[PDB]
Amino acid sequence: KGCWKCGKEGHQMKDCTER
Numbered sequence: 001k002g003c004w005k006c007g008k009e010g011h012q013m014k015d016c017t018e019r
């Protein structure tokens with residue numbers, strides 16, 4: 001659904017600002 005590490009779970013992992 002949301003991210004994989006971001007507990008917030010709202011955006012997409014692909015677009016996640018992990019970098």
Ligand SMILES: [Zn+2]
Nearest residue numbers: 003006016017
């Ligand atoms: Zn994220």
